[PDB]
Amino acid sequence: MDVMNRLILAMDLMNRDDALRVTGEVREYIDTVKIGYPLVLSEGMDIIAEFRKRFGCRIIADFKVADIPETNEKICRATFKAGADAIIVHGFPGADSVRACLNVAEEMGREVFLLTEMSNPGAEMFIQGAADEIARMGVDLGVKNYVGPSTRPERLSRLREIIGQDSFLISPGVGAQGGDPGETLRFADAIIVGRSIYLADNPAAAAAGIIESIKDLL
Amino acid sequence: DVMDVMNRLILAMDLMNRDDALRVTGEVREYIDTVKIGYPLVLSEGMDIIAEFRKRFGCRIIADFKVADIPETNEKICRATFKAGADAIIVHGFPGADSVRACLNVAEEMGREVFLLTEMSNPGAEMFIQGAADEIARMGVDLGVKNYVGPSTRPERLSRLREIIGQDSFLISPGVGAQGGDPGETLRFADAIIVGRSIYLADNPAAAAAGIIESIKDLLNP
Numbered sequence: 509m510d511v512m513n514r515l516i517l518a519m520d521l522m523n524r525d526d527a528l529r530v531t532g533e534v535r536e537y538i539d540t541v542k543i544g545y546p547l548v549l550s551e552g553m554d555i556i557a558e559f560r561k562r563f564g565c566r567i568i569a570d571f572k573v574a575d576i577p578e579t580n581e582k583i584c585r586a587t588f589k590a591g592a593d594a595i596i597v598h599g600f601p602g603a604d605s606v607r608a609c610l611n612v613a614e615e616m617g618r619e620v621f622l623l624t625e626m627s628n629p630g631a632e633m634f635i636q637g638a639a640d641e642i643a644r645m646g647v648d649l650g651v652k653n654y655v656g657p658s659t660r661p662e663r664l665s666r667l668r669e670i671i672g673q674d675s676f677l678i679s680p681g682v683g684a685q686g687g688d689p690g691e692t693l694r695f696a697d698a699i700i701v702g703r704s705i706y707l708a709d710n711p712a713a714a715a716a717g718i719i720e721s722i723k724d725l726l
Numbered sequence: 727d728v729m730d731v732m733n734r735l736i737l738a739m740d741l742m743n744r745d746d747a748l749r750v751t752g753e754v755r756e757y758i759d760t761v762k763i764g765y766p767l768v769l770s771e772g773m774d775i776i777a778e779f780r781k782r783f784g785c786r787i788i789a790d791f792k793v794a795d796i797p798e799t800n801e802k803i804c805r806a807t808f809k810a811g812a813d814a815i816i817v818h819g820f821p822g823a824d825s826v827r828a829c830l831n832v833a834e835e836m837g838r839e840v841f842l843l844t845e846m847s848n849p850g851a852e853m854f855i856q857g858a859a860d861e862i863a864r865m866g867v868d869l870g871v872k873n874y875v876g877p878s879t880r881p882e883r884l885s886r887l888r889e890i891i892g893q894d895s896f897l898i899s900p901g902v903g904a905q906g907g908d909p910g911e912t913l914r915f916a917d918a919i920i921v922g923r924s925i926y927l928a929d930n931p932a933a934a935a936a937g938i939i940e941s942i943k944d945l946l947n948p
């Protein structure tokens with residue numbers, strides 16, 4: 509996947525007018541938008557096609573898919589029907605649940621991203637101890653796209669070691685949660701950035717500033 | 727007090743088009759006053775489907791969204807979900823206490839309920855979730871969670887979950903029917919069973935529901 513400026517916008521504003529306006533303000537800087545449940549549950553799945561119509565951007569549906577295989581299949585189908593190019597899936601529920609997502613993605617010409625360790629402090633309780641094994645499970649299942657935490661660069665580096673240089677790795681927790689853009693890009697192919705951009709007084713200047721700080725990594 | 731689930735039976739309405747979902751739910755309305763609506767239906771038909779169910783049926787709505795994000799995003803998901811009219815939301819515990827707390831805080835503010843999913847019913851649950859489940863359950867109890875979800879497909883596990891959360895906590899359990907769980911045996915430990923396909927794919931969903939209820943007749947409350 510070829511992400512402009514190695515920067516993915518996490519568009520978690522919850523009203524259509526603001527989400528569209530702010531995305532428009534930063535469109536020159538990005539070509540990849542992560543759309544999650546805050547926006548989708550507030551404005552409907554039609555928002556995905558509308559982003560494509562307005563911006564032509566690729567869309568990653570961050571739905572943290574975490575159900576049994578039968579339900580995971582249905583969620584992936586509904587998500588790809590709405591025009592998402594990729595979907596983010598939890599590994600914690602086990603291999604069968606991940607395989608269910610991989611199957612639908614293959615059928616519809618899309619990608620699965622496997623979330624292995626989360627960026628919140630609570631991730632230390634249960635996920636972190638399973639994360640290396642979840643990553644190896646990804647490798648075993650043929651997963652090529654991964655998500656890992658900007659807030660723990662040593663853990664992000666370990667994830668990169670496990671998955672290899674050929675796999676694609678994106679990383680949230682940059683800015684608001686404390687992660688550094690440049691340090692994160694030592695290990696991740698692309699950084700995910702939400703609030704630092706979409707809640708900034710001037711979102712365009714914020715995006716430009718982040719890009720300036722990583723200009724020698726582009 | 728806990729939610730009063732008619733016949734101890736919750737419909738998992740995972741049909742993906744509005745017409746079929748509405749028809750089947752209407753067909754079983756005399757048996758079931760509590761419906762679990764998940765992402766298969768919501769992502770296909772929109773959050774207004776919750777409104778439509780409320781309008782058409784006299785049914786409580788549990789939003790099965792397995793909320794599993796960071797605290798900031800979890801809050802937003804819960805707010806949008808309760809705004810749409812869900813009585814309760816199901817959240818994962820494996821992302822940690824902060825993520826669960828975020829949901830509980832919104833539910834408290836908004837006058838709604840959180841259900842904590844501690845273990846899952848799929849075979850894959852043995853890989854990672856099973857080993858964390860007792861601690862996830864204990865964490866729920868420590869956080870003041872009152873409502874829980876655990877798997878009918880593993881009776882010994884469901885029994886242990888009931889022990890951890892105590893008799894006062896409310897426990898619902900999926901995996902009955904299609905996944906192999908038995909209604910009566912599950913109700914030894916769960917307050918209510920969740921049933922999807924063996925009702926909604928039946929030639930006569932009403933007959934299927936009635937049949938499940940007949941098999942557990944002596945377990946209903948006066």
Ligand SMILES: O=c1cc(O)n([C@@H]2O[C@H](COP(=O)(O)O)[C@@H](O)[C@H]2O)c(=O)[nH]1
Nearest residue numbers: 518626627680681684701702703796799
């Ligand atoms: O471990 C993870 C996985 C995520 O998808 N995310 C998501 O990435 C985004 C982070 O946004 P922000 O830059 O505002 O912190 C949010 O949409 C969040 O749900 C995360 O923060 N941590």
Ligand SMILES: O=c1cc(O)n([C@@H]2O[C@H](COP(=O)(O)O)[C@@H](O)[C@H]2O)c(=O)[nH]1
Nearest residue numbers: 576579738846847900901904921922923
């Ligand atoms: O561990 C769990 C947790 C669930 O919510 N579920 C949900 O319960 C329902 C089970 O439906 P069914 O009776 O068709 O197997 C589905 O909506 C599924 O997503 C489950 O099967 N296992």
Ligand SMILES: [Cl-]
Nearest residue numbers: 576577578848
């Ligand atoms: Cl399944």
Ligand SMILES: [Cl-]
Nearest residue numbers: 629630823824
């Ligand atoms: Cl925590």
Ligand SMILES: [Cl-]
Nearest residue numbers: 628796797798
């Ligand atoms: Cl957070």
Ligand SMILES: [Cl-]
Nearest residue numbers: 603604849850
């Ligand atoms: Cl498995």
Ligand SMILES: [Cl-]
Nearest residue numbers: 880881882883
């Ligand atoms: Cl068992």
Ligand SMILES: [Mg+2]
Nearest residue numbers: 550551773774
């Ligand atoms: Mg609306």
Ligand SMILES: [Mg+2]
Nearest residue numbers: 690721722723
């Ligand atoms: Mg720099």
